Each structure stands twice: as C-alpha cells, then as structure tokens.
Amino acid sequence: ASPRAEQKQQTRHALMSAARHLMESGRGFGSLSLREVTRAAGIVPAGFYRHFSDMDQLGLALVAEVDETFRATLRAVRRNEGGLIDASVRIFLDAVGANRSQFLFLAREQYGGSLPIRQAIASLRQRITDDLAADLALLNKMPHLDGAALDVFADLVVKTVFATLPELIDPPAADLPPHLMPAAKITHQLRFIMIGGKHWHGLP
Amino acid sequence: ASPRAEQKQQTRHALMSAARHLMESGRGFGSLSLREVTRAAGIVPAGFYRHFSDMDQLGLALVAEVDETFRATLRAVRRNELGGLIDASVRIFLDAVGANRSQFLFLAREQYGGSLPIRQAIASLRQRITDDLAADLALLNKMPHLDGAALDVFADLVVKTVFATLPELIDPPAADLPPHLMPAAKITHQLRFIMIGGKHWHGLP
Numbered sequence A: 001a002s003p004r005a006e007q008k009q010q011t012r013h014a015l016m017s018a019a020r021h022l023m024e025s026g027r028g029f030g031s032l033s034l035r036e037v038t039r040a041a042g043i044v045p046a047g048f049y050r051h052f053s054d055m056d057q058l059g060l061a062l063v064a065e066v067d068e069t070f071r072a073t074l075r076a077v078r079r080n081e082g083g084l085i086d087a088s089v090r091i092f093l094d095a096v097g098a099n100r101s102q103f104l105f106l107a108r109e110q111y112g113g114s115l116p117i118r119q120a121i122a123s124l125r126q127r128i129t130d131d132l133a134a135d136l137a138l139l140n141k142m143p144h145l146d147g148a149a150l151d152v153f154a155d156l157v158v159k160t161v162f163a164t165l166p167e168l169i170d171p172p173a174a175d176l177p178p179h180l181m182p183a184a185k186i187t188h189q190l191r192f193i194m195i196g197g198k199h200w201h202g203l204p
Numbered sequence B: 001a002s003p004r005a006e007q008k009q010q011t012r013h014a015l016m017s018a019a020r021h022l023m024e025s026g027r028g029f030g031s032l033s034l035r036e037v038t039r040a041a042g043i044v045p046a047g048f049y050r051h052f053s054d055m056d057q058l059g060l061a062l063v064a065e066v067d068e069t070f071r072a073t074l075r076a077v078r079r080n081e082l083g084g085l086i087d088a089s090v091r092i093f094l095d096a097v098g099a100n101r102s103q104f105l106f107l108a109r110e111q112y113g114g115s116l117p118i119r120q121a122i123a124s125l126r127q128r129i130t131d132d133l134a135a136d137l138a139l140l141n142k143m144p145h146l147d148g149a150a151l152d153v154f155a156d157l158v159v160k161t162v163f164a165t166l167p168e169l170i171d172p173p174a175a176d177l178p179p180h181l182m183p184a185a186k187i188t189h190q191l192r193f194i195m196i197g198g199k200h201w202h203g204l205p
C-alpha cells in the first residue's frame, strides 16, 4: 500500500466535490479551470497532479461515481416487486433530488467538448440499459421478445426516464395539469411502454 | 420605419452566428463573454446593445431561430404521406441535425444551463412542437379512443424519443454497433413500437 492512502482519497473526493459545487448553477465542465478546483479543495495548484493528470481525468472520475451507487439500486429494486414502475421512478427522482448537480452534469456533458467524457457517459448509460434488458429477460413477462428487441425496448425505457431531466430543474407552472407533472408523466409513459410491450412482435 | 434596418439585421445575425461558432466544440452559452462575441462578429463591444440588452437576449434570439423553420417542416410533412410518416419525420430531424448541428446541441445542452429564461424558452419551443403533434394526431384521428390528455402525454413521449437520441448523433458509432441500435434505425423502431402501443392503450386513469 501507498503511504497516507486515506488522506490522498479525501483530497481526491474534495477535488471532485469542488468540481460539482462549481457546476451547480449550470456551468459546463469544460469551463472549469484546474485552479478554481484546487483552491476550493484547499491544496496548491501543483497538488492536482497527484490525483489527476488533467481535467478530463477528473471528469471521468465524476462519471465513474454513479456506476457503484445509483446503478446498483435500480438493479436491486427489480428483485422485490404494477409497482416496479413507481419504485424505479422514485429511485431516479430521489437520486436527482439528493445529487442534482451530478445528474445535470451527466445529462449536459453528453453535449460537451470532451470526447472521453461523452463516451464514458454513453457507456454508463448503456450499462444501465443492459442491466434492464437482462432483467426483462429474467422476469420473463415478455417471452415473445428476443434479445435484440429487448435491447431496443430497454433503451426506450431508460431514455424515457432520463430525458425528463430538463423538467426536474425548475418548479412546474402553477397551471401544469397533474398528468403532465414530471413524476406522473414518466409513470404513465412507462405503463404505456409496458402495455405496448405485450402487443409488439419485436424487430423485423 | 427605422433607418438602415437590413444592415442592423446583418449585424444581428453576425453576432448570432459568432456565438454559435464559439459553441461548435461544446462550450456552454453561459461561458461566452460579450467581448468575444462582438470582436468575432467584427464590431465594437458597445455595438452589442443596439441588438441585445444582455447575453441572455442573444441566447433567446438563438432559440427563436428554430421556431420559424424546423417546427413548420414537421407539421408540413404530416399532411402528405402506412409506416411512411415515421421515416419522413425521422429524416426531417436527422437532416436538420446534420445541417444545423451546433444549434441542436445548444438546444439540448442549455436545457441544463445557467440561464432560467433560456431554459424556459427551450421548454416552450419543445412544447409547441409537442402540441402541434398532439393536435395533428387528433386531426388524423387514427386513435379515436384517446382523449386530449392522453394525446399530450403520448405526443410528449414521441418528441422525447426522437430529440433525446441527440447524444448518439455527435460522434461516429462503434464499429461493432448492431444495425438495429444505429440511431436512425433505433428511433424508427421505437416510434413504430409507440404507434403500435397507441392502438392498444386505453389512455389515462
């Protein structure tokens, strides 16, 4: 083991946490300078290089965080549960509320200037989609849909939930109908998708 | 009428396409300084306030450029075309993205940007496109069993299914990516699925 590993780790988390803080009001990752991040972390500018070779590597570390937290809880909830929809929506909604900046980061940096970061978010998205596709096969309530069809179906589900993010930033209009409020809308759309699954032949 | 209007409009567009140019490689609108845009536009910083009182206003003008172009083409295609209207509607989007990449990425990206008025202008634009489709669906009358509220939720799903595929239209696809997971085919498959599901859906509780 490397000496003072806990200390190094807390500084790493501090730098990551500093980046998220700076992006809270909608600043893109690509606009952050090393210096802002290291100062907020409470280390000298040179101390950044003990943890990350560049800002790209820091952004890659922010993406990787979701893989061992959020990703497993969606997978977990499929064992227990109608109401698999509500719980899955709730797990997303909860994760967004408690970690807003990070989800906005994931969504926004899909369109950012870093190729590595665009690719890492895509892979994260795909892993989530793959977990669902596999679970839909296991749960076996659409036994007429083969592997290829489930991949397309699972992509639609994940996107349906995730792409609602723009509607979860600001408070809804006073006059917004209750069936168009973010939580209910996702829910109606996922129930519609599940109904649609029953009648779909799959792919040509 | 105001003197030298065409010339003023020419400078307006220059400022606008200058901002677009600066955002070609993923820069957020919020990180643009007035000075960058003006000098890239080839004018004095003070000459910005002739067109826009602030950068927000420049951003709002960037959003307003989609409303009088793209929106009508999507409505236009629904009068003419059994499985045909899907492919044409998808192709309208895909071509619009090809010819106007930076613009659509701006539309997608600034949904999550630092500006509230710009977030709201994009949501409104998005909603008017959704509303057009919801109305056209009612007009076409091929799902007569679905009430107004059901079509709004359904139409919102359709638009999102297409628009939210944008992240897959930036870089080239992986060599080993299956034909059915290619963005154009995937959207097409997902929309055909949605239309099929529309037949058997009773709508909202």
Ligand SMILES: CCCCCCCCCCCCCCCC(=O)SCCNC(=O)CCNC(=O)[C@@H](O)C(C)(C)COP(=O)(O)OP(=O)(O)OC[C@H]1O[C@@H](n2cnc3c(N)ncnc32)[C@H](O)[C@@H]1OP(=O)(O)O
Pocket (backbone or CB within 6 Å): A199, A200, A201, A202, B074, B082, B083, B085, B086, B089, B090, B093, B107, B125, B126, B129, B133, B140, B142, B143, B158, B159, B160, B162, B163, B195, B196, B199
């Ligand atoms: C800032 C934001 C910018 C983003 C902008 C967003 C833009 C949004 C894009 C716009 C989206 C486009 C809107 C679509 C509008 C339409 O859908 S147009 C279609 C007419 N509208 C309707 O509502 C009617 C839909 N009707 C039906 O599906 C059927 O009721 C009907 C019989 C009328 C027509 O279907 P049809 O294709 O004739 O189906 P069938 O006769 O059953 O069979 C022939 C074809 O259908 C396929 N099929 C049938 N059933 C299935 C199932 N269960 N699974 C898979 N495939 C099925 C067959 O494969 C067959 O193939 P093909 O004929 O080759 O298509």
Ligand SMILES: CCCCCCCCCCCCCCCC(=O)SCCNC(=O)CCNC(=O)[C@@H](O)C(C)(C)COP(=O)(O)OP(=O)(O)OC[C@H]1O[C@@H](n2cnc3c(N)ncnc32)[C@H](O)[C@@H]1OP(=O)(O)O
Pocket (backbone or CB within 6 Å): A074, A082, A084, A085, A088, A089, A092, A106, A124, A125, A128, A132, A139, A141, A142, A157, A158, A159, A161, A162, A190, A194, A195, A197, A198, B200, B201, B202, B203, B204
């Ligand atoms: C970085 C990116 C981060 C983003 C992360 C994204 C996360 C993605 C979220 C994950 C999505 C959630 C996972 C989904 C997993 C599931 O789908 S769990 C469901 C089990 N799976 C299945 O495949 C079975 C689905 N089966 C069915 O729908 C039916 O075939 C079946 C009968 C088996 C069960 O459905 P059920 O609800 O019992 O329907 P019915 O028995 O027919 O009737 C009872 C209820 O259904 C409603 N109903 C029926 N028919 C309709 C129609 N046509 N329209 C509207 N409603 C209908 C009735 O109203 C009734 O109500 P209720 O019981 O209250 O639902």
